[PDB]
Each structure stands twice: as structure tokens, then as C-alpha cells.
Design a protein around this ligand. Structure first.
Ligand SMILES: C=CCN1CCC[C@H]1CNC(=O)c1cc(S(N)(=O)=O)cc(OC)c1OC
Ligand SMILES: [Zn+2]
Length: 256
């Protein structure tokens, strides 16, 4: 699977029939249809910079992984009763500044999106066990609006020169990715899925109301990553955003 026409979003259902499921992500958040939910608690993130582990070029994207052997780095509150353990963050982006985000808000497409990924360590003993469970996963999504350069992205962007081609991996240490979140943690939540194969319906989504900035040149750094292995012809990683999927009756709740 990929983001090519031959192996892309429109094709994923042939190998992963859940692609046409009732809980697929991402979605268009229509603000006139969201329901304020008084019981939603504030989002609580408490991440230990010593849990940052490595940065890896996975062909379609790059991932920053965290040590997830214990509860040093956790998400709590919002819609959750259980503690969720941080394991990764990554980005999605588009061929153009005009699109790139996965979620949209009242039909508006942002330039990129940050995903901070967690698994339910209260209920399950590993990411692999949690990944297919309705309550297994949690993602904080942040819409990225093209404008001013975002100095908080710097350590990440500086690291990409060491993982230029597919399969390249490097240490990535001493980083707290709560530094990337917006100052307001007002949020939408809905029950959803992984936005790429295997597309499991295992994700409680937390979408921040407030965007963060990114420059057109910072986005160019992401698109300059290469999907090919070292020594082959260069194939820039131009896009990795899935189109929005039908709500199929789900309710998007607002903390605000
Ligand atoms: C089940 C596949 C395991 N993969 C390899 C190791 C991490 C993972 C790669 N990334 C994802 O598949 C992945 C992607 C998202 S996303 N883009 O936010 O829907 C979320 C996630 O866990 C909340 C993910 O991990 C389960
Ligand atoms: Zn993602």
C-alpha cells in the first residue's frame, strides 16, 4: 500500500475492506453539527523528554518513536478513564500548501497535520495487542496552518538529513512533543480509525481547535524526504494525507 494512484487511498479497500467501514478517519468536522459534552474533562499530557528514542524513514512518512515500556509519558482526561501511553508522533502533508491535512474543519483544508499517538496501557500489555481494540489507541491531531516558520519543529527538521532515504533510522533523544501542541487544548473527539493501513477502528481522536504554524519552506523539508532506498533514483515523499471519510452517524463532541 502507498499514496500512489495504483496503491493509494482509493485502492486500500481491496486488501483492507474496513476502508469502507462505519468508523473511518479522517473526517470533516462540521461545527454546526458538533455536540458540546459537559462531561469531557481537560486533556492532560505529561511527557518525559528522556522517552524520545529514534526517528525512522518508513517510505511513506517518517516516525519519531518513544520508549513505551512504562508510564513515564502519558495522556489522561478528555473522554478517557484510562491512562494512554505515548509511543510516537508523525506528520501528514500534501503535494501543495492548499491541502496536506487529514482532518478538515467546515470543509477547510490545512497544509499539514501533527499526530501524537498513544496506546491503552491500563487495559493492554503492548502496542501490538492494543492496536486492534476499539479502546486501544488515542491520537491528538493538530491542524498545521501555512504561515510563520515554527521554531518548535526545528529539532525534528534538523534530524531529517540523517534519514533521507527509506529504511534509514537514527537516534532522536531528549524531546518532549507537548512543546508542539497549541496553547489551547480545547478539542473535538470522535470514535475513528488509523488513517492508513491496516485502518483498524481502534482510535479515539482528539482534534485541537487551535492550529499551529508551519512555513512553506518547513513543508518543503518534509517533501524533500525520499521514499526510495539509498542508491536508487530519487522519489520525493510529496504527499501522505488520506481524504475525509463519511461520519456514518457518528457524533463529533466538542469540549468547548
Ligand atoms: C499497526 C501498525 C504498526 N505500525 C508500525 C509501528 C507503528 C505503526 C506505524 N504507524 C501507524 O500505523 C499509526 C498511525 C496512526 S494515525 N496516522 O494517526 O491514524 C495512529 C497510530 O497509533 C495510534 C499508528 O500506530 C498504530
Ligand atoms: Zn497519522
Amino acid at each position: 500500500w502507498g499514496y500512489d494512484d495504483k496503491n493509494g487511498p482509493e485502492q486500500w479497500s481491496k486488501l483492507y475492506p474496513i476502508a469502507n467501514g462505519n468508523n473511518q478517519s479522517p473526517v470533516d468536522i462540521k461545527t454546526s453539527e458538533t455536540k458540546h459534552d459537559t462531561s469531557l474533562k481537560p486533556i492532560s499530557v505529561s511527557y518525559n523528554p528522556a522517552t524520545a528514542k529514534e526517528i525512522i524513514n518508513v517510505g511513506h512518512s517518517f516516525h519519531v518513536n518513544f520508549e513505551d515500556n512504562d508510564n513515564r509519558s502519558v495522556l489522561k482526561g478528555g473522554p478517557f478513564s484510562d491512562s494512554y501511553r505515548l509511543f510516537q508522533f508523525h506528520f501528514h502533508w500534501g503535494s501543495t500548501n492548499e491541502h496536506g491535512s487529514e482532518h478538515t474543519v467546515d470543509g477547510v483544508k490545512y497544509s499539514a497535520e501533527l499526530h501524537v499517538a498513544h496506546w491503552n496501557s491500563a487495559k493492554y500489555s503492548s502496542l501490538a495487542e492494543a492496536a486492534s481494540k476499539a479502546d486501544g489507541l488515542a491520537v491528538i491531531g493538530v491542524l498545521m496552518k501555512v504561515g510563520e516558520a515554527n521554531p518548535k519543529l526545528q529539532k525534528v527538521l534538523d534530524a531529517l538529513q540523517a534519514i533521507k532515504t527509506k529504511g534509514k533510522r537514527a537516534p532522536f533523544t531528549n524531546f518532549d512533543p507537548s512543546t508542539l501542541l497549541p496553547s489551547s487544548l480545547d478539542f473535538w473527539t470522535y470514535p475513528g480509525s488509523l488513517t492508513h493501513p491496516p485502518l483498524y477502528e481502534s482510535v479515539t481522536w482528539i482534534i485541537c481547535k487551535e492550529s499551529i504554524s508551519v512555513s512553506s519552506e518547513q513543508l518543503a523539508q518534509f517533501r524533500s524526504l525520499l521514499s526510495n532506498v539509498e542508491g536508487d533514483n530519487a522519489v520525493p515523499m510529496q504527499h501522505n494525507n488520506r481524504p475525509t471519510q463519511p461520519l456514518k452517524g457518528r457524533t463529533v463532541r466538542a469540549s468547548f
